[PDB]
């Protein structure tokens with residue numbers, strides 16, 4: 001059938017005309033098949049033959065297993081068709097789904113060919129079956145239904161099905177139906193008798209619109225759906241002696257996927273191997289830490305884990321745990337500890353960061369996910385003391401706000417690992433540091449002078465103004481006692497260090513951090529350079 | 544009869560993805576939008592419309608309102624609403640003693656929108672967990688939030704306001720987007736009475752917050768007053784002055800700098816020379832007075848920066864060329880994102896009153912944090928443009944009070 005529904009007006013892009021690609025000549029078996037196929041389609045209404053007035057043409061092919069498929073190459077018509085509203089904005093996530101008592105799935109056969117094409121647009125879908133050795137005119141046809149391979153077909157189909165279903169939905173809100181491509185999945189909380197009664201009204205409501213039409217484990221979209229739980233579809237980690245780049249990329253992918261429900265999956269040590277430019281076929285020996293992570297992953301996957309579905313009447317609880325190395329892991333549940341979903345956060349927003357900054361940005365990411373999946377933020381449980389956090393975000397310059405949360409003692413806990421003094425330290429040595437770099441030679445001198453008369457100038461190769469100014473601070477921290485005042489003219493270095501970094505990609509910065517943790521008091525001050533600020537000009541001299 | 548609205552040459556409509564919304568806000572919009580559909584102000588659209596602008600609910604009042612982010616559409620019609628049919632901005636509004644802001648957005652629903660333009664006004668109410676397809680709509684009437692709306696309505700507006708202006712020639716009435724700014728020099732009780740009469744005039748046409756811009760004074764860069772002076776205090780003073788030197792012409796520093804001559808311990812109290820006290824004096828006079836040689840340019844975007852100062856206080860500058868500050872202010876007094884969101888609205892309002900433009904904001908916050916939360920406190924009906932930045936740590940203290 002061809003649905004009686006109204007058609008969707010289609011137009012080409014402004015200033016553009018429909019296609020006129022020439023029909024490559026075909027072998028005689030190919031065109032014979034195309035003649036067989038096009039007369040079956042013509043009799044069912046899917047196509048119609050046309051006069052040679054129509055100047056439009058799109059090439060057609062055929063390929064074969066022992067029966068033949070018609071393939072129309074809509075590349076040029078697609079390039080000239082208007083853009084459409086994108087078909088889906090996102091996939092429903094299992095953890096957002098409600099528990100259902102009875103689920104059956106139904107598949108639309110003849111999906112696109114059951115939906116009419118805008119009569120004003122059919123002229124451009126014209127194609128031509130050529131003659132044998134392209135002697136005589138060929139048989140010209142056009143589509144009356146949505147052709148497969150045209151860029152409007154997914155949009156207009158899914159839209160047609162929404163208009164068709166919206167009566168039955170409003171006359172039956174309790175029932176849920178999911179449209180994806182040809183698929184109709186239908187769920188309800190009715191008893192398996194009265195439920196199969198409602199599926200028939202749906203079928204009969206479908207056939208009145210020209211759409212003719214299973215077991216608990218529905219393998220869908222990578223997931224395994226059951227009526228009362230979900231999980232990821234089975235994860236098999238290969239047992240290889242040699243790992244290729246392509247093997248590890250696929251493993252990182254399955255693990256990333258498995259981490260939606262399997263808590264605590266770690267992948268960093270596996271990802272570290274992919275860094276480099278090596279070919280897909282090259283074998284990478286597993287490092288010691290990578291084979292340690294593969295071990296923990298194999299164990300986490302040992303016994304099946306499932307996820308539960310969402311009860312809209314209950315709060316969501318999100319728990320986060322630090323796994324070190326900037327890897328975070330989280331679980332969302334409504335009754336402890338029956339998880340709706342798990343995940344991991346391991347990004348690096350910036351070059352230098354601290355656990356408090358990392359934990360906040362993991363909170364934001366879980367929060368956005370929550371609004372997508374359930375439409376509300378969860379109540380958080382965080383491995384950070386309420387006062388560690390109050391300390392940090394009131395003194396820090398960026399704004400923040402994490403929603404309702406509670407401390408939960410699941411070590412490791414998030415700490416600030418040092419605190420810069422707010423006032424200069426009396427009876428502590430004042431270092432006036434400074435770094436510089438001649439920008440053609442790429443040589444630099446990092447140095448300091450002291451109010452107690454000490455001086456020092458080390459020389460660096462392979463450096464920049466930025467790196468030397470951090471070397472000069474590193475020096476002052478090496479050579480000083482537990483308490484120390486430092487005066488730099490590098491806003492660069494002051495910005496990094498006043499952020500209380502925890503970790504960095506710069507092992508220089510990491511050395512400075514290990515110094516600042518060992519100290520007991522450190523005051524850091526900035527003066528402008530070349531303004532002649534006492535000590536500043538003298539270590540500027542020495543450099 | 545509709546006014547044909549055309550986009551800038553060779554520009555397409557907005558294709559801006561809808562941000563995720565919470566259950567309570569999706570429910571609010573679904574009520575609002577079925578009601579507007581009955582009344583015919585919007586109509587469902589099909590997949591042949593590829594355009595989208597995002598939509599949100601605010602609460603300004605105890606009733607959800609609908610807010611459409613037309614920032615992208617406004618950028619793409621900007622020839623139309625600014626040069627071809629611009630509303631002139633009166634220089635007198637910033638002088639008036641009282642300014643009341645009134646919402647007249649509901650006027651735009653009277654007016655049909657050019658039938659060949661309604662496709663660019665498309666928006667989607669989305670679905671929790673994407674379980675259902677988005678409800679899609681387009682406007683038929685002049686939409687609130689679109690800068691084309693006041694442009695098209697300005698002929699009808701001056702007709703509505705014609706009697707009231709004739710009878711109160713000392714009252715300034717400026718229209719920006721969905722708001723009427725009404726400025727008078729009257730005593731506050733007389734002022735409110737005049738606003739009450741003006742609501743009556745509007746009320747005869749389907750049209751049902753008090754600023755004192757006179758009391759908007761610049762927040763000058765403040766130099767500490769002190770008994771003793773450590774070298775740390777003078778260093779922080781030279782740094783704060785030398786940077787102020789880049790804005791205010793005439794700041795001098797070198798007399799201070801020779802109080803710091805050797806490599807002195809930071810905590811040692813340095814005696815002040817009397818030419819130093821002479822110079823802190825001379826500098827304070829400059830920093831109190833407005834910047835010399837900085838003028839608004841109607842052709843250049845306004846920039847606003849905001850620095851968090853801790854303890855619920857925030858500083859801000861408005862400028863078109865960095866360090867040429869047209870305006871510097873503070874804003875004060877719970878929640879960092881709530882306060883910033885209040886600060887942006889305040890600075891935008893002042894920016895509409897003073898220039899007829901909203902500034903582009905440099906926000907000191909994580910983009911994800913901001914986009915998550917700003918709707919929860921946003922109560923204006925426009926939206927300014929914004930970037931996200933990392934506040935230069937020195938700048939923070941150079942504007943501290």
Ligand SMILES: Cc1cc(/C=C/C#N)cc(C)c1N1CCC(=O)Nc2cnc(Nc3ccc(C#N)cc3)nc21
Pocket residue numbers: 092096097098099100103105176177178185186187216217218219220225226227228309674675
């Ligand atoms: C019904 C369905 C099916 C699929 C795929 C099936 C395959 N393959 C995908 C979605 C998104 C839904 N949808 C329909 C849309 C809607 O609006 N709401 C929904 C609410 N709750 C559920 N839960 C649920 C519980 C248990 C099972 C099982 N077994 C399946 C589903 N499903 C919903």
